[PDB]
Amino acid sequence: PPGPPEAVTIDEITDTTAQLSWRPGPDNHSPITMYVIQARTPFSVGWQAVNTVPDLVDGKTFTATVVGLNPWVEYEFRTVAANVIGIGEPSRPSEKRRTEEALPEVTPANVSGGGGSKSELVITWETVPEELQNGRGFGYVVAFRPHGKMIWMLTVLASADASRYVFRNESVRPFSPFEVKVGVFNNKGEGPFSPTTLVYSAEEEPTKPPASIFARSLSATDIEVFWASPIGRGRIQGYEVKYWRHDDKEENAKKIRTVGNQTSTKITNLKGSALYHLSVKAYNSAGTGPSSATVNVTTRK
């Protein structure tokens, strides 16, 4: 296998391209027939191969152009020569050198949203990776409009780390569809927008209480509670069961929550031969509804 090539230098650097040069290393009694070039950045995971011109570098070429680099990233480079035997030892790395800035080009992935409290529209996205921001002053532009309308409303978020925006206004009807895209910008200029997606605003909280509530004591620490769903009313994600010992204030109560359609539950780790008060509430992404009547049950022993 071949020895390490030497003297890797960065002769030119633009926003996405660099011109590199190097000098041959010992070939170890076998003809050197190829050079490959690797790059390392703070964000790459160690050394990676790069695209070059010529797309394949022979053993006679000691300089080459590297393409498809990220704007505004710090780069080191090294070269490796190859024999017929195998791949050689990597060179020592070149000096570090930062590419120039450019317009941003990558929009955030997984633009979505939903939920929230009354009068809200909740919009979420994944922050654009740092090696893809292409320059200082990187931020987002959240564009949203009611489905069926023409005017886009625009919010700027100066912070590259922003992953979430909440719009609240009386104009927002409950569970209404908005068209949503998220764009990017940096000091060099404005970049593209994500593909439009549909996001629904916050839904209405439950409006009716659970009915037909009662409980049964099983052991001295376990009771069972049953209710019926309300009739009419809102969407219901589960129930909040609220319980407290006869000797505590109601505001000291513990709460457990329920997910799905179960219209019953089981409370544990209670004190025996003691009275307990309970009440149930429906909830959804927007909050909780009215409370059932309070029911009274005593533990077994």
DSSP 237-272: -EEEEEEEETTS-GGG-EEEE--SS--EEEE-SPPT
Other C-beta atoms within 10 Å of 180: how many?
A: 27
Measured in whole angstroms, the distance separating CA 261 from the mean position of its chain's CA atoms is 29
Interior/surface letters 218-257, b for 16+ CB within 10 angstroms, e for the rest: eeeeebebbbebbeeebebbbbbbbbbbeeeeeeebeeee
Amino acid at 197: T
Angstrom distances, CA of residue 300 to CA of 217, 225, 266, 274? 6, 15, 15, 8
* CA–centroid distance for 244 within its chain: 39
Q: Is the domain 109-200 a CATH 2.60.40.10 member?
A: yes
Distance between CA atoms of residues 43 and 37, nearest Å: 18
User: Which strand (E) or helix (H) includes residue 212?
Assistant: strand 211-217
CA pair distance 213, 227, nearest whole angstrom: 4
CB atoms within 10 A of CB 266: 12
SS3 percent helix, strand, coil of the chain, rounded to 5, is 0, 45, 55
Q: Which CATH number fits domain 6-99: 2.60.40.10, 1.10.3720.10, 3.90.79.10, 2.40.128.20?
A: 2.60.40.10
Q: Are residues 170 and 90 in contact, defined by beta-carbon separation less than 8 angstroms? A: no
* Lookup: tokens for 240: 């909040």
C-alpha dist (Å) from residue 100 to 72, 76, 107, 133, 164 = 5, 15, 20, 12, 29
Task: Read off the amino acid at residue 128.
Answer: V
- What is d(CA 219, CA 301) in angstroms, rounded to the nearest whole number? 7
The two tokens of residue 155 are 């919010």
Q: Which of 38, 8, 30, 22 is nearest to 82 (CA)?
A: 30
CA 167 from centre of chain: 19
Experimentally, the structure was elucidated by: X-ray
Degrees, nearest 5: CA angle 150-151-154: 140
- Separation in Å, CA 30 to CA 1, 6, 287: 7, 18, 74
Tokens for 8, please give them: 């890797």
The SS3 of residue 58 is: coil
Which phi and psi angles does 83 have, rounded to 5°? -90, 180
| Fold type of domain 211-298 | Immunoglobulin-like (2.60.40)
Q: How far is CA 1 from the centre of its chain?
A: 45
Return d(Cα 223, Cα 78) in angstroms, integer. Answer: 69
64-84 as b/e: b if 16+ CB within 10 A? bebeebbbbbebbbbbbbbbe
Contact 112, 197 (CB under 8 A): yes
For residue 188, give the DSSP letter: T
Query: What does the domain layout of the chain look like in residue ranges?
Result: 6-99, 109-200, 211-298
Say if residues 270 and 276 touch (Cβ distance below 8 Å): yes
Q: Are 258 and 193 in contact (CB under 8 A)?
A: no
Same fold, 6-99 and 109-200: yes
- Left (φ > 0), alpha (ψ -120 to 50) or beta: where does 111 sit? beta
For residues 256 and 182, the answer to whether their CB atoms sit within 8 Å is no
Please state the separation of Cα 89 from the chain's center in Å: 39
Are 298 and 278 in contact, with CB atoms under 8 Å apart? no
The owner of tokens 């890797």 is 8
d(CA 35, CA 260): 61
Cα 103-76-36 angle, rounded to 5 deg: 105
Resolution (A): 2.5
Q: What is the spatial distance between Cα 297 and Cα 255, in angstroms, rounded to a whole number?
A: 16
Alpha-carbon distances of 203 from 153, 166, 175, 190, rounded to whole Å? 21, 14, 4, 34
Q: Enumerate long-range contacts of 112-117, CB under 8 Å, 24 or more apart.
A: 112/197, 112/199, 113/180, 113/199, 114/199, 114/200, 114/285, 115/202, 115/203, 115/285, 115/286, 116/166, 116/168, 116/201, 116/202, 116/285, 116/286, 117/202, 117/286, 117/287
